[PDB]
Amino acid sequence: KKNKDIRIIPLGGVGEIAKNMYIVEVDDEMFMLDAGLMFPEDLGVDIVIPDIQYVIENKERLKGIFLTHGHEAAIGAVSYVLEQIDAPVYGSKLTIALVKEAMKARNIKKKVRYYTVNHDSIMRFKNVNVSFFNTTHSIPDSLGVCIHTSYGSIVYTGEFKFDQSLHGHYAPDLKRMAEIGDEGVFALISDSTEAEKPGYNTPENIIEHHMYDAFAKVKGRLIVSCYASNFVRIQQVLNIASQLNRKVSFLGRSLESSFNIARKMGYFDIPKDLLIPINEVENYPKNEVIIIATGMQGEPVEALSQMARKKHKIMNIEEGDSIFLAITASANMEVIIADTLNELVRAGAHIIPNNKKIHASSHGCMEELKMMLNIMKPEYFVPVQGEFKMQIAHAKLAAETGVAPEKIFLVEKGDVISYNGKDMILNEKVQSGNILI
Ligand SMILES: [Mn+2]
């Protein structure tokens, strides 16, 4: 049908990192794109979520919740949303499997209407059709969202990248993206996390090969520090462990929720009886094991500080152990890294150097964001998922790719972008904020 009004409203993910949540309204129908949390600005063990009081005041029109990927930045606030509102949850195979976990983990029995979607799904509503396309990210079964209106598509990319080595459940949809482009994009909502970094990311194959060559020189025990969110990195050391006749052991007695669900669903490639439990590590010589230390915020680095300063509940460093920090150093956590480096050197461990000519990220750098802009060729553009400078960087790339400058909108949380059908205006503000927990 001919649509009249379009509204686009960020309640999270702008003027901050993480906590994606973008409200889109087409006439009398509202769609919530992602529902993320955020860890509180520079103490662990607590979470922040968006203020959905605007959604609650218009709860009769919320036709669903669409989840791009299974990161806490996309699904971390779903449970809390669902306490206050009943509405159907759309996501990929994995994304849904993990939302279910998050619910069971908070001992919530309330039944939820789930729909598993894929890149061939076309979910039909009264005014609009929602479709999807595959994106490349650090977690598999990531999707973009496309809301078909008569003014054209409203595309939300989620978090995404363009990597030439990832080709599985990480493969991008060059073709349906190119289709979305021609059909015509009204508005593109894209991830500005690394819009400041020029050029491209380092391909994951290259990062893996660099890790291998370094890990091949280690004559004693090896400990690798990951984010739990970065399934690609996890996967990579598993590959390497196999190729060096080593075995892998995660910190703790139980494997991490996300990883273990995805493993059980067959997302990872793990040769049989490669994982040794943390119980049975002393049994094998130093040179036959990689220990993987995962975490959420800075826990990965916090964990190494305990393992060196001997005070780790589970296992500690001994002299001769080699260490690898498989994370990028944001300025936030540049401090506690250097503190921890010292503590590791005191403990008498070899720090495997981080190659400075490598830039590793879940998110497209400048040229990767221009890749997505050149394929969608959007009329209007709205950079999200970043601080103010990050959104500005992305805005400039949009201009470069031929988007009209007057049609590029930088928005704080609660800003409302309306479309009468003639002009697009930012002539309203609504309720938004941070809700600690
Ligand atoms: Mn992500």
Coordinates of C-alpha atoms and ligand atoms in Angstrom, one line a residue:
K1 CA 0.0 0.0 0.0
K2 CA 0.9 3.7 -0.3
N3 CA 2.5 4.6 3.0
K4 CA 2.1 8.1 4.5
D5 CA 4.5 8.7 7.5
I6 CA 7.9 7.2 8.4
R7 CA 9.5 7.9 11.8
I8 CA 13.0 6.8 12.9
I9 CA 14.0 7.0 16.6
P10 CA 17.2 5.8 18.3
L11 CA 16.8 4.8 22.0
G12 CA 20.3 3.4 22.2
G13 CA 23.5 3.1 20.2
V14 CA 24.1 6.8 19.5
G15 CA 26.4 9.0 21.5
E16 CA 27.7 5.7 23.0
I17 CA 29.2 2.3 22.1
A18 CA 26.8 -0.7 22.2
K19 CA 23.2 -0.7 23.4
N20 CA 21.8 -0.8 19.9
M21 CA 18.0 -0.1 19.8
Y22 CA 16.4 1.7 16.8
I23 CA 12.6 2.3 16.6
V24 CA 11.1 2.6 13.1
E25 CA 7.5 3.5 12.5
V26 CA 5.7 3.3 9.2
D27 CA 2.2 4.8 9.6
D28 CA 0.5 3.0 12.5
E29 CA 3.1 0.2 12.8
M30 CA 6.2 0.3 15.0
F31 CA 9.3 -1.9 14.7
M32 CA 12.1 -2.2 17.3
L33 CA 15.4 -3.0 15.6
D34 CA 17.7 -4.6 18.2
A35 CA 17.6 -4.4 22.0
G36 CA 21.1 -4.2 23.3
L37 CA 22.7 -3.5 26.7
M38 CA 25.9 -1.6 27.6
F39 CA 28.5 -2.1 30.3
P40 CA 28.8 1.0 32.4
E41 CA 31.4 3.6 31.5
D42 CA 35.0 3.2 33.0
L43 CA 33.3 -1.9 37.7
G44 CA 32.2 -5.2 36.1
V45 CA 29.1 -7.3 37.0
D46 CA 26.2 -4.8 36.2
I47 CA 24.3 -3.7 33.0
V48 CA 22.6 -0.7 31.4
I49 CA 19.5 -0.8 29.2
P50 CA 17.5 1.7 27.1
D51 CA 14.4 3.6 28.3
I52 CA 11.4 2.2 26.3
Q53 CA 8.8 4.4 28.0
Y54 CA 8.0 5.8 24.5
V55 CA 7.4 2.2 23.3
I56 CA 5.2 1.5 26.3
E57 CA 3.0 4.6 25.7
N58 CA 2.5 3.2 22.1
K59 CA 2.7 -0.5 22.9
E60 CA -0.4 -1.4 20.9
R61 CA 1.4 -0.7 17.6
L62 CA 4.7 -2.6 18.2
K63 CA 4.5 -5.4 15.6
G64 CA 7.8 -6.9 16.7
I65 CA 11.5 -7.0 17.7
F66 CA 14.1 -7.7 15.1
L67 CA 17.5 -9.0 16.3
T68 CA 20.6 -8.7 14.0
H69 CA 22.9 -10.9 16.0
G70 CA 23.5 -12.7 19.3
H71 CA 25.8 -10.1 20.9
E72 CA 24.8 -8.5 24.2
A73 CA 24.9 -5.2 22.1
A74 CA 21.9 -6.5 20.1
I75 CA 19.9 -8.9 22.4
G76 CA 21.1 -8.0 25.9
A77 CA 18.0 -6.0 26.8
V78 CA 15.4 -8.3 25.3
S79 CA 14.5 -10.0 28.5
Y80 CA 13.9 -6.7 30.3
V81 CA 11.9 -5.4 27.3
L82 CA 9.7 -8.5 27.4
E83 CA 8.9 -8.0 31.1
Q84 CA 7.2 -4.7 30.2
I85 CA 5.8 -5.6 26.8
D86 CA 4.6 -8.7 24.9
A87 CA 5.6 -8.7 21.2
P88 CA 7.0 -11.3 18.8
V89 CA 10.8 -11.8 18.6
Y90 CA 12.5 -12.2 15.2
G91 CA 16.1 -13.3 14.8
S92 CA 18.4 -15.9 13.1
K93 CA 18.8 -19.5 14.2
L94 CA 21.6 -18.7 16.6
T95 CA 20.3 -15.3 17.7
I96 CA 17.0 -16.9 18.8
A97 CA 18.7 -19.8 20.5
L98 CA 20.6 -17.3 22.7
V99 CA 17.6 -15.1 23.5
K100 CA 16.1 -18.4 24.8
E101 CA 19.2 -18.9 26.9
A102 CA 19.1 -15.4 28.3
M103 CA 15.4 -16.0 29.4
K104 CA 16.1 -19.4 31.0
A105 CA 19.1 -17.8 32.7
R106 CA 16.9 -15.2 34.5
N107 CA 14.5 -18.1 35.4
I108 CA 11.7 -16.4 33.5
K109 CA 8.9 -18.8 32.4
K110 CA 6.6 -16.2 30.6
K111 CA 6.0 -17.7 27.1
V112 CA 7.5 -15.8 24.2
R113 CA 6.4 -15.8 20.5
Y114 CA 9.7 -16.5 18.6
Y115 CA 10.2 -16.6 14.8
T116 CA 13.5 -17.9 13.3
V117 CA 14.2 -15.9 10.1
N118 CA 16.9 -16.3 7.4
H119 CA 18.0 -14.2 4.4
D120 CA 15.1 -15.7 2.4
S121 CA 12.4 -14.7 5.0
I122 CA 9.8 -12.2 4.1
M123 CA 7.8 -11.3 7.2
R124 CA 4.4 -9.7 6.2
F125 CA 2.6 -7.0 8.2
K126 CA -0.3 -4.7 7.5
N127 CA 1.5 -1.7 5.9
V128 CA 5.0 -3.1 5.2
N129 CA 7.0 -6.2 4.5
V130 CA 10.3 -6.8 6.5
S131 CA 13.0 -8.8 4.8
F132 CA 16.6 -9.7 5.7
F133 CA 20.2 -10.2 4.3
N134 CA 23.4 -11.8 5.6
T135 CA 26.2 -9.7 7.0
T136 CA 29.8 -10.5 8.0
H137 CA 30.6 -10.1 11.7
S138 CA 32.5 -11.7 14.6
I139 CA 29.5 -13.9 15.4
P140 CA 27.7 -16.2 12.9
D141 CA 24.1 -15.9 11.7
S142 CA 24.1 -12.1 11.6
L143 CA 21.4 -10.4 9.5
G144 CA 20.5 -7.0 8.2
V145 CA 16.9 -5.8 8.3
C146 CA 15.0 -4.3 5.3
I147 CA 11.6 -2.7 5.9
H148 CA 9.8 -2.2 2.5
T149 CA 7.8 1.0 2.2
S150 CA 6.4 2.9 -0.8
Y151 CA 9.1 5.5 -0.3
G152 CA 11.6 2.7 -0.5
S153 CA 13.6 0.4 1.9
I154 CA 14.6 1.2 5.4
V155 CA 17.8 -0.8 5.9
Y156 CA 19.4 -1.4 9.3
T157 CA 22.8 -3.1 8.8
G158 CA 23.3 -4.1 12.4
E159 CA 27.0 -4.5 13.3
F160 CA 28.9 -5.7 10.2
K161 CA 32.1 -5.9 8.1
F162 CA 33.5 -7.0 4.7
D163 CA 36.1 -9.7 4.9
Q164 CA 37.2 -11.7 1.9
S165 CA 38.2 -14.9 4.0
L166 CA 34.8 -15.3 5.8
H167 CA 32.6 -17.5 3.7
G168 CA 30.4 -19.7 5.9
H169 CA 27.6 -18.6 8.2
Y170 CA 29.7 -15.4 8.1
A171 CA 29.2 -14.9 4.3
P172 CA 27.8 -11.6 3.2
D173 CA 24.9 -11.3 0.7
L174 CA 26.6 -9.4 -2.2
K175 CA 23.5 -10.3 -4.3
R176 CA 20.4 -9.5 -2.1
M177 CA 22.3 -6.3 -1.0
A178 CA 22.7 -5.4 -4.6
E179 CA 18.9 -6.1 -5.1
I180 CA 18.0 -4.0 -2.1
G181 CA 20.0 -1.2 -3.7
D182 CA 18.1 -1.1 -7.1
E183 CA 14.7 -1.7 -5.6
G184 CA 15.6 1.6 -3.9
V185 CA 16.7 2.5 -0.4
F186 CA 14.9 5.3 1.4
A187 CA 17.0 5.3 4.5
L188 CA 20.2 3.4 5.5
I189 CA 21.0 3.0 9.2
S190 CA 24.7 1.8 9.5
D191 CA 27.3 0.9 12.0
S192 CA 29.8 3.7 12.7
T193 CA 32.0 1.8 15.2
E194 CA 35.2 2.1 13.1
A195 CA 34.2 5.0 10.8
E196 CA 37.3 6.9 12.2
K197 CA 39.8 4.2 11.0
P198 CA 41.0 4.7 7.4
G199 CA 41.3 1.9 4.9
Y200 CA 40.1 -1.7 5.7
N201 CA 40.4 -4.3 8.5
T202 CA 43.1 -6.9 8.2
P203 CA 41.5 -10.0 6.6
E204 CA 40.8 -12.8 9.2
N205 CA 42.9 -15.4 7.3
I206 CA 45.9 -13.0 7.6
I207 CA 45.3 -12.6 11.4
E208 CA 45.0 -16.3 11.8
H209 CA 48.3 -17.0 9.9
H210 CA 50.1 -14.3 12.0
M211 CA 48.8 -16.0 15.1
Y212 CA 50.0 -19.4 13.9
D213 CA 53.6 -18.3 13.1
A214 CA 53.8 -16.8 16.6
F215 CA 52.1 -19.8 18.3
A216 CA 54.5 -22.1 16.4
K217 CA 57.5 -20.6 18.3
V218 CA 56.1 -21.3 21.8
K219 CA 58.1 -24.0 23.5
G220 CA 56.1 -24.0 26.8
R221 CA 52.5 -23.3 27.8
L222 CA 50.4 -20.8 25.8
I223 CA 47.5 -18.7 27.1
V224 CA 45.3 -16.7 24.7
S225 CA 42.9 -14.0 25.8
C226 CA 39.7 -13.5 23.8
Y227 CA 36.4 -11.7 24.1
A228 CA 33.6 -14.3 24.3
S229 CA 31.7 -12.4 21.6
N230 CA 34.5 -13.0 19.0
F231 CA 33.6 -16.5 17.7
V232 CA 35.9 -16.0 14.7
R233 CA 39.0 -15.6 17.0
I234 CA 37.9 -18.5 19.2
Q235 CA 37.5 -20.6 16.0
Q236 CA 41.0 -19.5 14.9
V237 CA 43.0 -20.8 17.9
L238 CA 41.0 -24.1 17.7
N239 CA 42.3 -24.4 14.1
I240 CA 45.8 -23.5 15.2
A241 CA 45.7 -25.8 18.3
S242 CA 44.9 -28.7 16.0
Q243 CA 47.7 -27.9 13.5
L244 CA 50.3 -27.9 16.3
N245 CA 49.1 -31.1 18.1
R246 CA 48.0 -29.0 21.1
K247 CA 44.7 -29.2 23.0
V248 CA 42.4 -26.4 24.1
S249 CA 41.0 -25.7 27.6
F250 CA 38.7 -22.8 28.5
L251 CA 38.9 -21.0 31.9
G252 CA 36.4 -22.5 34.4
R253 CA 34.5 -25.8 34.9
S254 CA 31.7 -24.9 32.6
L255 CA 32.1 -23.5 29.0
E256 CA 30.6 -20.1 28.3
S257 CA 26.8 -20.0 27.5
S258 CA 27.1 -18.4 24.0
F259 CA 30.0 -20.6 22.8
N260 CA 28.5 -23.9 24.1
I261 CA 25.1 -23.4 22.6
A262 CA 26.6 -22.5 19.3
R263 CA 29.0 -25.5 19.5
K264 CA 26.1 -27.8 20.3
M265 CA 24.3 -26.3 17.1
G266 CA 27.5 -27.2 15.1
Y267 CA 28.7 -23.7 14.3
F268 CA 32.3 -24.4 15.3
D269 CA 34.7 -26.9 13.6
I270 CA 36.3 -28.9 16.4
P271 CA 38.1 -32.2 15.9
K272 CA 36.9 -34.9 18.3
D273 CA 38.4 -34.8 21.8
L274 CA 40.4 -31.6 21.2
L275 CA 39.0 -29.9 24.3
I276 CA 40.6 -31.0 27.6
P277 CA 38.6 -29.8 30.7
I278 CA 40.5 -27.4 33.0
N279 CA 40.5 -30.3 35.4
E280 CA 42.9 -32.4 33.3
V281 CA 45.5 -29.9 32.2
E282 CA 48.3 -30.8 34.6
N283 CA 48.3 -34.2 32.9
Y284 CA 49.7 -32.9 29.6
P285 CA 53.2 -31.3 29.2
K286 CA 53.4 -27.5 29.1
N287 CA 53.9 -27.5 25.3
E288 CA 50.7 -29.4 24.4
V289 CA 48.0 -27.0 25.6
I290 CA 46.5 -23.6 24.7
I291 CA 44.4 -22.1 27.5
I292 CA 41.8 -19.7 26.3
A293 CA 40.6 -16.9 28.7
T294 CA 37.4 -15.4 27.5
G295 CA 35.5 -12.4 28.9
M296 CA 32.9 -9.6 28.3
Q297 CA 34.2 -6.2 29.2
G298 CA 37.9 -6.2 30.4
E299 CA 37.6 -9.5 32.2
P300 CA 39.9 -11.0 29.6
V301 CA 42.7 -8.7 30.8
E302 CA 41.5 -8.8 34.4
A303 CA 41.8 -12.6 34.3
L304 CA 45.5 -12.4 33.2
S305 CA 46.2 -10.0 36.1
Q306 CA 45.0 -12.7 38.6
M307 CA 46.8 -15.5 36.8
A308 CA 50.1 -13.6 37.1
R309 CA 49.6 -12.0 40.4
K310 CA 49.1 -15.5 41.7
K311 CA 45.6 -15.2 43.1
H312 CA 43.4 -16.9 40.4
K313 CA 40.7 -19.2 41.7
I314 CA 41.4 -21.8 39.0
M315 CA 44.9 -21.6 37.5
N316 CA 47.9 -19.3 37.7
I317 CA 51.0 -18.5 35.6
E318 CA 54.3 -20.1 36.1
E319 CA 57.7 -19.0 34.8
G320 CA 58.1 -19.8 31.1
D321 CA 54.4 -19.5 30.0
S322 CA 53.8 -17.4 26.9
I323 CA 50.8 -15.0 26.6
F324 CA 48.8 -13.5 23.7
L325 CA 46.3 -10.7 23.9
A326 CA 43.9 -11.4 21.1
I327 CA 42.0 -8.1 21.5
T328 CA 42.3 -4.6 20.2
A329 CA 43.3 -2.0 22.8
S330 CA 40.6 0.7 23.0
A331 CA 41.7 3.8 24.9
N332 CA 39.3 2.8 27.7
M333 CA 41.3 -0.3 28.5
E334 CA 44.8 0.9 27.4
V335 CA 45.6 1.5 31.0
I336 CA 44.9 -1.8 32.7
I337 CA 46.7 -3.6 29.8
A338 CA 50.0 -1.9 30.5
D339 CA 49.5 -2.6 34.2
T340 CA 48.9 -6.2 33.4
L341 CA 51.9 -6.5 31.0
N342 CA 54.2 -5.6 33.9
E343 CA 52.5 -8.1 36.2
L344 CA 52.9 -10.8 33.5
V345 CA 56.6 -10.0 33.1
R346 CA 57.2 -10.2 36.8
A347 CA 55.5 -13.6 36.8
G348 CA 58.2 -14.4 34.2
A349 CA 56.0 -15.0 31.1
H350 CA 56.9 -14.2 27.5
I351 CA 54.6 -11.6 26.0
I352 CA 53.9 -12.5 22.4
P353 CA 54.1 -9.1 20.7
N354 CA 51.0 -7.7 19.0
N355 CA 51.8 -6.8 15.4
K356 CA 51.1 -3.1 15.0
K357 CA 50.5 -3.3 11.3
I358 CA 47.4 -5.4 12.1
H359 CA 44.0 -3.8 12.6
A360 CA 41.4 -6.3 13.8
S361 CA 37.7 -5.4 14.4
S362 CA 34.2 -6.8 14.2
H363 CA 33.2 -3.6 12.3
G364 CA 34.0 -2.1 8.9
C365 CA 36.6 0.6 8.7
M366 CA 36.1 3.6 6.4
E367 CA 36.3 1.8 3.1
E368 CA 34.1 -1.1 4.3
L369 CA 31.4 1.4 5.3
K370 CA 31.6 2.9 1.8
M371 CA 31.2 -0.6 0.4
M372 CA 27.8 -0.8 2.1
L373 CA 27.0 2.8 1.1
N374 CA 27.8 2.3 -2.6
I375 CA 25.7 -0.9 -2.8
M376 CA 22.6 0.6 -1.0
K377 CA 22.9 4.0 -2.6
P378 CA 20.5 5.3 0.1
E379 CA 18.5 8.5 -0.3
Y380 CA 18.6 9.4 3.4
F381 CA 21.4 8.2 5.7
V382 CA 21.5 7.9 9.5
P383 CA 24.8 6.8 11.2
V384 CA 24.3 4.8 14.4
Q385 CA 26.3 2.6 16.8
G386 CA 29.1 5.0 17.9
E387 CA 30.0 8.2 19.8
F388 CA 29.4 11.6 18.2
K389 CA 32.7 11.7 16.4
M390 CA 32.2 8.2 15.0
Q391 CA 28.8 9.2 13.5
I392 CA 30.5 12.3 12.0
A393 CA 33.2 10.2 10.4
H394 CA 30.5 8.0 8.8
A395 CA 28.4 11.0 7.8
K396 CA 31.4 12.2 5.7
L397 CA 31.8 8.9 4.0
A398 CA 28.1 9.0 3.1
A399 CA 28.6 12.4 1.4
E400 CA 31.6 11.0 -0.4
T401 CA 29.5 8.2 -1.8
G402 CA 27.0 10.7 -3.3
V403 CA 24.3 10.9 -0.6
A404 CA 22.9 14.4 -0.4
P405 CA 24.5 16.3 2.5
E406 CA 21.2 17.8 3.6
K407 CA 19.8 14.2 3.8
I408 CA 22.4 13.0 6.3
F409 CA 21.1 13.1 9.9
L410 CA 23.2 13.0 13.1
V411 CA 20.9 12.2 16.1
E412 CA 21.2 12.0 19.9
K413 CA 19.0 9.4 21.7
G414 CA 15.4 10.3 21.6
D415 CA 15.6 12.4 18.4
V416 CA 12.8 11.8 16.0
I417 CA 13.2 11.8 12.2
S418 CA 9.8 12.2 10.4
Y419 CA 8.9 12.0 6.7
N420 CA 5.7 13.7 5.7
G421 CA 6.2 12.4 2.1
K422 CA 7.7 15.7 1.0
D423 CA 10.5 16.6 3.4
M424 CA 12.4 14.9 6.2
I425 CA 12.6 16.9 9.5
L426 CA 14.0 16.5 13.0
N427 CA 11.2 18.5 14.6
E428 CA 10.5 16.3 17.7
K429 CA 12.1 14.8 20.8
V430 CA 10.9 11.9 22.9
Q431 CA 11.8 10.1 26.1
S432 CA 15.1 8.2 26.2
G433 CA 17.9 7.4 28.7
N434 CA 20.1 4.9 30.6
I435 CA 18.5 2.5 33.0
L436 CA 21.1 0.9 35.3
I437 CA 20.4 -2.5 36.9
Ligands
MN1 MN 28.9 -7.2 17.5

